[PDB]
Design a protein around this ligand. Structure first.
Ligand code: HEM
Ligand SMILES: C[C@]12CC[C@H]3[C@@H](CCC4=CC(=O)CC[C@@]43C)[C@@H]1CC[C@@H]2O
Length: 400
Protein backbone atom coordinates (compact mmCIF):
# COMPACT_ATOMS: atom_id res chain seq x y z
CA UNK A 1 0.00 0.00 0.00
CA UNK A 2 0.95 3.64 0.76
CA UNK A 3 1.90 6.48 3.05
CA UNK A 4 -1.43 8.23 3.77
CA UNK A 5 -1.71 11.84 4.89
CA UNK A 6 -4.75 12.63 7.08
CA UNK A 7 -5.68 16.19 6.23
CA UNK A 8 -6.08 18.28 9.32
CA UNK A 9 -9.79 19.04 9.89
CA UNK A 10 -8.72 22.22 11.74
CA UNK A 11 -6.28 23.43 9.03
CA UNK A 12 -3.70 24.26 11.76
CA UNK A 13 -0.66 24.41 9.46
CA UNK A 14 -1.69 24.53 5.79
CA UNK A 15 1.83 25.37 4.59
CA UNK A 16 3.24 22.16 6.16
CA UNK A 17 0.33 20.04 4.96
CA UNK A 18 0.73 21.38 1.39
CA UNK A 19 4.48 20.66 1.54
CA UNK A 20 3.82 17.13 2.79
CA UNK A 21 1.32 16.61 -0.07
CA UNK A 22 3.91 17.78 -2.62
CA UNK A 23 6.49 15.45 -1.05
CA UNK A 24 4.09 12.49 -1.42
CA UNK A 25 3.04 13.29 -4.94
CA UNK A 26 2.30 13.47 -7.76
CA UNK A 27 -0.41 11.04 -6.56
CA UNK A 28 -0.62 11.23 -2.73
CA UNK A 29 -2.84 8.99 -0.67
CA UNK A 30 -4.90 11.12 1.73
CA UNK A 31 -7.56 10.69 4.35
CA UNK A 32 -10.38 13.27 4.31
CA UNK A 33 -11.86 14.41 7.62
CA UNK A 34 -14.40 11.76 8.60
CA UNK A 35 -11.96 8.96 7.75
CA UNK A 36 -12.49 8.68 3.99
CA UNK A 37 -9.45 7.56 1.97
CA UNK A 38 -8.98 9.16 -1.45
CA UNK A 39 -6.08 10.11 -3.71
CA UNK A 40 -4.85 13.65 -4.28
CA UNK A 41 -2.93 14.98 -7.23
CA UNK A 42 -0.37 17.39 -5.80
CA UNK A 43 1.95 18.28 -8.70
CA UNK A 44 1.14 20.77 -11.46
CA UNK A 45 1.93 18.83 -14.61
CA UNK A 46 0.21 15.63 -13.46
CA UNK A 47 -2.87 17.59 -12.33
CA UNK A 48 -3.20 19.15 -15.81
CA UNK A 49 -2.99 15.67 -17.37
CA UNK A 50 -5.64 14.27 -14.99
CA UNK A 51 -7.94 17.30 -15.44
CA UNK A 52 -8.07 16.52 -19.22
CA UNK A 53 -8.08 12.70 -18.94
CA UNK A 54 -11.45 11.22 -20.03
CA UNK A 55 -10.92 8.36 -17.52
CA UNK A 56 -11.25 10.87 -14.64
CA UNK A 57 -14.97 11.70 -14.48
CA UNK A 58 -17.35 13.50 -12.18
CA UNK A 59 -19.92 10.62 -12.26
CA UNK A 60 -20.30 9.39 -8.59
CA UNK A 61 -21.64 6.08 -9.95
CA UNK A 62 -17.97 5.29 -10.71
CA UNK A 63 -17.04 5.59 -6.99
CA UNK A 64 -16.43 2.09 -5.52
CA UNK A 65 -16.65 3.23 -1.90
CA UNK A 66 -19.96 5.03 -2.62
CA UNK A 67 -21.51 1.94 -4.23
CA UNK A 68 -20.29 -0.22 -1.30
CA UNK A 69 -22.12 2.03 1.24
CA UNK A 70 -18.85 3.24 2.88
CA UNK A 71 -19.77 6.97 2.75
CA UNK A 72 -21.92 8.29 5.61
CA UNK A 73 -24.97 10.35 4.52
CA UNK A 74 -24.20 12.81 7.35
CA UNK A 75 -20.52 13.12 6.48
CA UNK A 76 -19.89 16.90 6.76
CA UNK A 77 -18.21 16.82 3.32
CA UNK A 78 -21.26 15.13 1.70
CA UNK A 79 -22.43 18.45 0.13
CA UNK A 80 -19.10 18.72 -1.65
CA UNK A 81 -18.84 14.99 -2.54
CA UNK A 82 -22.43 14.51 -3.74
CA UNK A 83 -24.08 17.83 -4.67
CA UNK A 84 -27.18 17.94 -6.82
CA UNK A 85 -26.75 17.41 -10.57
CA UNK A 86 -25.26 20.49 -12.29
CA UNK A 87 -22.40 21.26 -14.65
CA UNK A 88 -20.10 20.43 -11.67
CA UNK A 89 -21.08 16.76 -11.56
CA UNK A 90 -21.15 15.83 -15.27
CA UNK A 91 -18.86 15.61 -18.30
CA UNK A 92 -19.27 15.70 -22.09
CA UNK A 93 -22.68 16.39 -23.66
CA UNK A 94 -24.50 16.96 -20.39
CA UNK A 95 -21.69 19.32 -19.23
CA UNK A 96 -22.09 21.51 -22.33
CA UNK A 97 -25.91 21.47 -21.81
CA UNK A 98 -25.65 22.45 -18.14
CA UNK A 99 -22.76 25.01 -18.49
CA UNK A 100 -23.33 26.99 -21.67
CA UNK A 101 -25.74 29.72 -20.57
CA UNK A 102 -23.99 30.37 -17.24
CA UNK A 103 -20.57 30.50 -18.89
CA UNK A 104 -21.93 32.92 -21.53
CA UNK A 105 -23.12 35.30 -18.81
CA UNK A 106 -19.61 35.46 -17.34
CA UNK A 107 -17.44 36.15 -20.41
CA UNK A 108 -14.99 39.04 -20.09
CA UNK A 109 -17.24 41.40 -22.04
CA UNK A 110 -20.30 40.52 -19.98
CA UNK A 111 -18.29 40.89 -16.73
CA UNK A 112 -16.94 44.27 -17.90
CA UNK A 113 -20.64 45.41 -18.02
CA UNK A 114 -20.72 44.73 -14.20
CA UNK A 115 -17.70 46.97 -13.48
CA UNK A 116 -19.65 50.10 -12.61
CA UNK A 117 -21.94 48.26 -10.16
CA UNK A 118 -19.05 46.31 -8.59
CA UNK A 119 -17.08 49.59 -8.26
CA UNK A 120 -20.05 51.41 -6.66
CA UNK A 121 -20.56 48.58 -4.17
CA UNK A 122 -16.80 48.44 -3.33
CA UNK A 123 -16.77 52.18 -2.68
CA UNK A 124 -19.96 52.00 -0.52
CA UNK A 125 -18.45 49.23 1.60
CA UNK A 126 -15.27 51.31 2.12
CA UNK A 127 -17.47 54.29 3.02
CA UNK A 128 -19.16 52.20 5.80
CA UNK A 129 -15.95 51.02 7.57
CA UNK A 130 -16.02 52.24 11.17
CA UNK A 131 -13.23 52.35 13.72
CA UNK A 132 -9.45 52.44 13.61
CA UNK A 133 -9.23 48.58 13.47
CA UNK A 134 -11.73 46.51 11.51
CA UNK A 135 -12.23 42.90 10.62
CA UNK A 136 -11.67 43.63 6.94
CA UNK A 137 -13.04 40.17 6.10
CA UNK A 138 -16.44 40.64 7.75
CA UNK A 139 -16.69 44.31 6.73
CA UNK A 140 -15.33 44.31 3.18
CA UNK A 141 -13.91 41.12 1.64
CA UNK A 142 -16.94 38.96 2.62
CA UNK A 143 -19.83 41.24 1.62
CA UNK A 144 -18.57 42.37 -1.81
CA UNK A 145 -18.52 38.94 -3.51
CA UNK A 146 -21.68 37.76 -1.76
CA UNK A 147 -23.64 40.80 -2.88
CA UNK A 148 -22.29 40.44 -6.44
CA UNK A 149 -23.23 36.77 -6.82
CA UNK A 150 -26.58 37.23 -5.08
CA UNK A 151 -27.48 40.01 -7.53
CA UNK A 152 -26.28 37.91 -10.50
CA UNK A 153 -28.49 34.96 -9.39
CA UNK A 154 -31.60 36.89 -8.32
CA UNK A 155 -31.20 36.03 -4.58
CA UNK A 156 -33.09 38.43 -2.28
CA UNK A 157 -30.51 40.39 -0.19
CA UNK A 158 -32.76 39.81 2.85
CA UNK A 159 -31.80 36.10 2.68
CA UNK A 160 -28.03 36.71 2.76
CA UNK A 161 -27.59 36.63 6.56
CA UNK A 162 -29.23 33.20 6.82
CA UNK A 163 -27.31 31.95 3.79
CA UNK A 164 -24.13 33.02 5.60
CA UNK A 165 -25.08 30.97 8.66
CA UNK A 166 -25.87 27.89 6.51
CA UNK A 167 -22.60 28.15 4.55
CA UNK A 168 -20.66 28.36 7.84
CA UNK A 169 -22.15 24.96 8.78
CA UNK A 170 -21.80 23.52 5.24
CA UNK A 171 -18.06 24.24 5.19
CA UNK A 172 -17.02 23.44 8.74
CA UNK A 173 -15.44 20.02 9.45
CA UNK A 174 -16.77 20.55 13.01
CA UNK A 175 -20.50 20.73 12.11
CA UNK A 176 -22.18 17.96 14.09
CA UNK A 177 -23.28 15.14 11.76
CA UNK A 178 -26.86 15.58 13.02
CA UNK A 179 -26.92 19.15 11.49
CA UNK A 180 -25.39 18.23 8.10
CA UNK A 181 -28.50 17.10 6.19
CA UNK A 182 -30.73 19.84 7.67
CA UNK A 183 -28.21 22.47 6.47
CA UNK A 184 -28.25 20.99 2.94
CA UNK A 185 -32.07 20.86 2.94
CA UNK A 186 -32.41 24.47 4.03
CA UNK A 187 -29.81 25.71 1.50
CA UNK A 188 -31.63 23.85 -1.31
CA UNK A 189 -34.90 25.39 -0.03
CA UNK A 190 -33.57 28.93 -0.41
CA UNK A 191 -32.42 28.20 -3.96
CA UNK A 192 -35.80 26.55 -4.77
CA UNK A 193 -37.72 29.61 -3.46
CA UNK A 194 -35.47 31.80 -5.61
CA UNK A 195 -36.22 29.71 -8.74
CA UNK A 196 -39.97 29.76 -7.98
CA UNK A 197 -39.85 33.56 -7.58
CA UNK A 198 -37.95 34.16 -10.82
CA UNK A 199 -40.28 31.83 -12.74
CA UNK A 200 -43.31 33.81 -11.52
CA UNK A 201 -41.66 37.26 -11.74
CA UNK A 202 -38.75 37.04 -14.16
CA UNK A 203 -36.02 39.67 -13.93
CA UNK A 204 -32.68 40.51 -15.61
CA UNK A 205 -30.69 38.01 -13.47
CA UNK A 206 -29.14 34.73 -14.57
CA UNK A 207 -31.68 32.54 -12.75
CA UNK A 208 -34.55 34.22 -14.64
CA UNK A 209 -32.58 33.59 -17.88
CA UNK A 210 -31.99 29.90 -17.11
CA UNK A 211 -35.74 29.46 -16.53
CA UNK A 212 -36.71 31.35 -19.71
CA UNK A 213 -34.24 29.16 -21.70
CA UNK A 214 -35.46 25.81 -20.31
CA UNK A 215 -39.22 26.57 -20.96
CA UNK A 216 -39.21 24.58 -24.30
CA UNK A 217 -37.14 21.60 -22.97
CA UNK A 218 -33.59 20.39 -23.93
CA UNK A 219 -32.00 22.91 -21.42
CA UNK A 220 -32.09 22.74 -17.57
CA UNK A 221 -34.80 21.14 -15.42
CA UNK A 222 -35.95 23.13 -12.36
CA UNK A 223 -33.97 20.67 -10.14
CA UNK A 224 -30.83 21.36 -12.23
CA UNK A 225 -31.45 25.17 -12.00
CA UNK A 226 -31.77 24.86 -8.19
CA UNK A 227 -28.43 22.95 -7.98
CA UNK A 228 -26.85 25.41 -10.43
CA UNK A 229 -27.92 28.35 -8.24
CA UNK A 230 -26.38 26.71 -5.17
CA UNK A 231 -23.17 26.01 -7.15
CA UNK A 232 -22.98 29.65 -8.39
CA UNK A 233 -23.72 31.31 -5.04
CA UNK A 234 -21.26 29.07 -3.17
CA UNK A 235 -18.42 29.01 -5.79
CA UNK A 236 -18.80 32.74 -6.49
CA UNK A 237 -18.53 34.00 -2.91
CA UNK A 238 -16.43 31.54 -0.93
CA UNK A 239 -13.36 31.73 -3.20
CA UNK A 240 -13.40 35.41 -4.13
CA UNK A 241 -13.57 36.46 -0.49
CA UNK A 242 -10.42 34.41 0.30
CA UNK A 243 -8.67 35.82 -2.77
CA UNK A 244 -9.16 39.37 -1.49
CA UNK A 245 -8.20 38.35 2.10
CA UNK A 246 -5.08 36.51 0.98
CA UNK A 247 -3.96 39.37 -1.27
CA UNK A 248 -4.11 41.78 1.68
CA UNK A 249 -2.28 39.33 3.91
CA UNK A 250 0.41 38.72 1.25
CA UNK A 251 1.01 42.43 0.65
CA UNK A 252 1.07 43.09 4.45
CA UNK A 253 3.70 40.30 4.99
CA UNK A 254 5.75 41.40 1.94
CA UNK A 255 5.94 45.17 2.41
CA UNK A 256 8.66 45.64 -0.25
CA UNK A 257 6.24 44.21 -2.82
CA UNK A 258 3.34 46.26 -1.49
CA UNK A 259 5.58 49.32 -2.06
CA UNK A 260 6.12 48.24 -5.72
CA UNK A 261 2.36 48.02 -6.37
CA UNK A 262 1.49 51.27 -4.56
CA UNK A 263 4.24 53.14 -6.52
CA UNK A 264 3.10 51.64 -9.90
CA UNK A 265 6.28 49.54 -10.40
CA UNK A 266 4.03 46.41 -10.26
CA UNK A 267 0.44 46.12 -11.32
CA UNK A 268 -2.57 44.89 -9.33
CA UNK A 269 -3.13 41.98 -11.72
CA UNK A 270 0.30 40.65 -10.72
CA UNK A 271 -0.80 40.67 -7.05
CA UNK A 272 -4.04 38.84 -7.89
CA UNK A 273 -2.33 36.22 -10.07
CA UNK A 274 0.50 35.57 -7.61
CA UNK A 275 -2.05 35.35 -4.74
CA UNK A 276 -3.95 32.77 -6.77
CA UNK A 277 -0.79 30.69 -7.35
CA UNK A 278 0.85 31.09 -3.94
CA UNK A 279 -2.27 31.13 -1.77
CA UNK A 280 -5.26 29.87 -3.75
CA UNK A 281 -8.62 30.23 -2.05
CA UNK A 282 -9.32 26.57 -2.92
CA UNK A 283 -6.87 24.12 -1.41
CA UNK A 284 -8.66 21.01 -2.77
CA UNK A 285 -11.48 20.21 -5.13
CA UNK A 286 -13.72 17.22 -4.65
CA UNK A 287 -14.13 14.95 -6.57
CA UNK A 288 -13.36 12.77 -9.59
CA UNK A 289 -13.43 9.01 -10.10
CA UNK A 290 -11.34 6.76 -12.31
CA UNK A 291 -13.21 4.59 -14.81
CA UNK A 292 -10.01 2.58 -15.49
CA UNK A 293 -6.61 2.23 -13.78
CA UNK A 294 -4.61 5.40 -14.52
CA UNK A 295 -0.85 5.58 -14.03
CA UNK A 296 0.25 8.74 -12.20
CA UNK A 297 3.99 8.93 -11.73
CA UNK A 298 5.12 5.51 -10.40
CA UNK A 299 1.67 4.81 -8.83
CA UNK A 300 -1.63 3.55 -10.25
CA UNK A 301 -4.93 5.33 -9.51
CA UNK A 302 -7.16 2.24 -9.47
CA UNK A 303 -10.49 2.07 -11.28
CA UNK A 304 -13.31 3.05 -8.95
CA UNK A 305 -11.05 5.13 -6.68
CA UNK A 306 -11.48 8.83 -6.09
CA UNK A 307 -9.28 11.83 -6.82
CA UNK A 308 -9.18 15.30 -5.33
CA UNK A 309 -7.14 18.05 -7.03
CA UNK A 310 -4.83 19.70 -4.48
CA UNK A 311 -4.57 23.19 -6.05
CA UNK A 312 -3.10 24.61 -2.85
CA UNK A 313 -0.15 22.24 -2.75
CA UNK A 314 0.51 22.27 -6.49
CA UNK A 315 0.52 26.09 -6.63
CA UNK A 316 4.02 25.96 -5.03
CA UNK A 317 5.35 23.16 -7.25
CA UNK A 318 9.04 23.89 -7.97
CA UNK A 319 8.81 21.78 -11.19
CA UNK A 320 6.30 24.38 -12.53
CA UNK A 321 7.67 27.63 -11.05
CA UNK A 322 11.32 26.99 -10.16
CA UNK A 323 13.16 27.12 -6.85
CA UNK A 324 11.30 30.26 -5.70
CA UNK A 325 7.89 28.53 -6.04
CA UNK A 326 7.49 28.47 -2.23
CA UNK A 327 7.70 32.28 -1.94
CA UNK A 328 5.28 35.08 -2.73
CA UNK A 329 6.80 37.17 -5.54
CA UNK A 330 4.57 39.40 -7.66
CA UNK A 331 7.55 40.04 -9.97
CA UNK A 332 7.99 36.39 -10.93
CA UNK A 333 7.93 35.09 -14.42
CA UNK A 334 6.90 31.42 -14.61
CA UNK A 335 7.01 29.17 -17.72
CA UNK A 336 3.78 27.69 -16.32
CA UNK A 337 0.65 29.81 -15.71
CA UNK A 338 -1.09 28.82 -12.47
CA UNK A 339 -4.04 26.48 -12.69
CA UNK A 340 -5.86 27.76 -9.59
CA UNK A 341 -9.03 28.12 -11.76
CA UNK A 342 -8.67 24.52 -12.98
CA UNK A 343 -7.86 23.20 -16.44
CA UNK A 344 -9.78 21.40 -19.12
CA UNK A 345 -13.54 21.49 -19.68
CA UNK A 346 -14.44 22.26 -16.03
CA UNK A 347 -12.11 25.34 -15.79
CA UNK A 348 -13.75 28.02 -13.71
CA UNK A 349 -16.31 30.00 -15.75
CA UNK A 350 -16.20 32.70 -13.08
CA UNK A 351 -12.48 33.51 -13.41
CA UNK A 352 -13.07 36.84 -15.21
CA UNK A 353 -15.62 37.87 -12.61
CA UNK A 354 -13.33 36.99 -9.68
CA UNK A 355 -10.45 38.87 -11.30
CA UNK A 356 -12.68 41.95 -11.82
CA UNK A 357 -13.95 41.86 -8.22
CA UNK A 358 -10.42 41.53 -6.72
CA UNK A 359 -9.02 43.95 -9.34
CA UNK A 360 -11.53 46.62 -8.31
CA UNK A 361 -11.55 45.87 -4.54
CA UNK A 362 -7.78 45.82 -3.91
CA UNK A 363 -6.80 49.13 -5.56
CA UNK A 364 -9.91 50.79 -4.15
CA UNK A 365 -8.99 49.63 -0.61
CA UNK A 366 -5.38 50.79 -0.82
CA UNK A 367 -6.38 54.06 -2.56
CA UNK A 368 -8.64 54.80 0.45
CA UNK A 369 -6.29 53.44 3.14
CA UNK A 370 -2.71 53.59 1.83
CA UNK A 371 -1.22 52.77 5.24
CA UNK A 372 -3.50 49.81 6.01
CA UNK A 373 -1.75 46.92 7.65
CA UNK A 374 -2.50 43.90 9.85
CA UNK A 375 -3.59 44.79 13.40
CA UNK A 376 -2.19 41.46 14.73
CA UNK A 377 1.02 39.60 13.98
CA UNK A 378 0.58 37.46 10.84
CA UNK A 379 1.24 34.37 12.98
CA UNK A 380 -2.03 35.09 14.87
CA UNK A 381 -4.12 34.71 11.68
CA UNK A 382 -5.97 31.40 11.75
CA UNK A 383 -7.54 29.18 9.14
CA UNK A 384 -11.16 28.15 9.65
CA UNK A 385 -11.70 24.37 9.96
CA UNK A 386 -12.64 24.10 6.28
CA UNK A 387 -10.49 21.44 4.74
CA UNK A 388 -11.03 22.27 1.05
CA UNK A 389 -10.75 26.10 1.39
CA UNK A 390 -8.03 28.47 2.53
CA UNK A 391 -10.21 30.79 4.60
CA UNK A 392 -9.34 32.83 7.66
CA UNK A 393 -11.52 33.43 10.67
CA UNK A 394 -10.88 37.19 10.54
CA UNK A 395 -8.58 39.78 8.99
CA UNK A 396 -7.83 42.40 11.66
CA UNK A 397 -6.58 45.55 9.91
CA UNK A 398 -5.45 48.94 11.22
CA UNK A 399 -6.78 51.22 8.45
CA UNK A 400 -4.65 54.31 9.11
C1 HEM B 1 -10.84 33.34 -6.86
C2 HEM B 1 -11.97 32.89 -7.09
C3 HEM B 1 -12.23 31.53 -7.64
C4 HEM B 1 -11.45 30.42 -7.64
C5 HEM B 1 -10.07 30.26 -7.07
C6 HEM B 1 -12.20 29.39 -8.33
C7 HEM B 1 -11.72 28.13 -8.62
C8 HEM B 1 -12.38 27.17 -9.34
C9 HEM B 1 -11.83 25.91 -9.73
C10 HEM B 1 -10.45 25.42 -9.38
C11 HEM B 1 -12.79 25.26 -10.51
C12 HEM B 1 -12.67 23.92 -11.18
C13 HEM B 1 -12.57 22.81 -10.18
C14 HEM B 1 -12.12 21.56 -10.90
O1 HEM B 1 -12.69 21.19 -11.95
O2 HEM B 1 -11.25 20.83 -10.33
C15 HEM B 1 -13.95 26.10 -10.48
C16 HEM B 1 -15.15 25.79 -11.00
C17 HEM B 1 -16.31 26.57 -10.96
N1 HEM B 1 -16.33 27.87 -10.53
FE1 HEM B 1 -14.83 28.96 -9.83
N2 HEM B 1 -13.44 29.90 -8.69
C18 HEM B 1 -13.49 31.24 -8.32
C19 HEM B 1 -14.52 32.11 -8.55
C20 HEM B 1 -15.78 31.81 -9.11
C21 HEM B 1 -16.84 32.71 -9.30
C22 HEM B 1 -16.73 34.20 -8.99
C23 HEM B 1 -17.85 31.97 -9.86
C24 HEM B 1 -19.17 32.40 -10.20
C25 HEM B 1 -19.62 33.59 -10.30
C26 HEM B 1 -17.41 30.60 -10.00
C27 HEM B 1 -18.10 29.55 -10.52
C28 HEM B 1 -17.63 28.28 -10.71
C29 HEM B 1 -18.44 27.20 -11.37
C30 HEM B 1 -19.89 27.40 -11.80
C31 HEM B 1 -17.61 26.15 -11.48
C32 HEM B 1 -17.88 24.80 -12.04
C33 HEM B 1 -17.49 24.68 -13.48
C34 HEM B 1 -17.63 23.31 -14.07
O3 HEM B 1 -17.45 22.31 -13.31
O4 HEM B 1 -17.82 23.21 -15.33
N3 HEM B 1 -16.11 30.54 -9.57
N4 HEM B 1 -13.67 27.31 -9.85
C1 LIG C 1 -20.65 22.00 -4.09
C2 LIG C 1 -20.78 23.50 -4.36
C3 LIG C 1 -20.44 23.83 -5.79
C4 LIG C 1 -18.95 23.70 -6.08
C5 LIG C 1 -18.08 24.54 -5.13
C6 LIG C 1 -18.43 24.26 -3.66
C7 LIG C 1 -17.66 25.17 -2.72
C8 LIG C 1 -16.17 24.95 -2.91
C9 LIG C 1 -15.74 25.14 -4.34
C10 LIG C 1 -14.67 25.87 -4.64
C11 LIG C 1 -14.02 25.93 -5.93
O1 LIG C 1 -12.98 26.53 -6.13
C12 LIG C 1 -14.71 25.26 -7.04
C13 LIG C 1 -16.21 25.04 -6.79
C14 LIG C 1 -16.54 24.41 -5.42
C15 LIG C 1 -16.08 22.96 -5.40
C16 LIG C 1 -19.93 24.45 -3.49
C17 LIG C 1 -20.57 24.32 -2.10
C18 LIG C 1 -22.08 24.13 -2.39
C19 LIG C 1 -22.21 23.96 -3.91
O2 LIG C 1 -23.30 23.06 -4.22
Amino acid sequence: MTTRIALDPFVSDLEAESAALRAAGPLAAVELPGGVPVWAVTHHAEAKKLLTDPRLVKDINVWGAWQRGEIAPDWPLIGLANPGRSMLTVDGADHRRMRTLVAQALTPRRVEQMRERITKLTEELLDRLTGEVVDLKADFAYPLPMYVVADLMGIDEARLPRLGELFEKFFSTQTPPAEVIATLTELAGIMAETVAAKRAAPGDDLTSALILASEDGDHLTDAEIVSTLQLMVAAGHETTISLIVNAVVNLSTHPEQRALVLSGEADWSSVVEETLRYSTPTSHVLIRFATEDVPVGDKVLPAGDALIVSYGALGRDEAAHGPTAGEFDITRSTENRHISFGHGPHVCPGAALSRLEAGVALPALYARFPKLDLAVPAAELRNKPVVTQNDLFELPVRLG
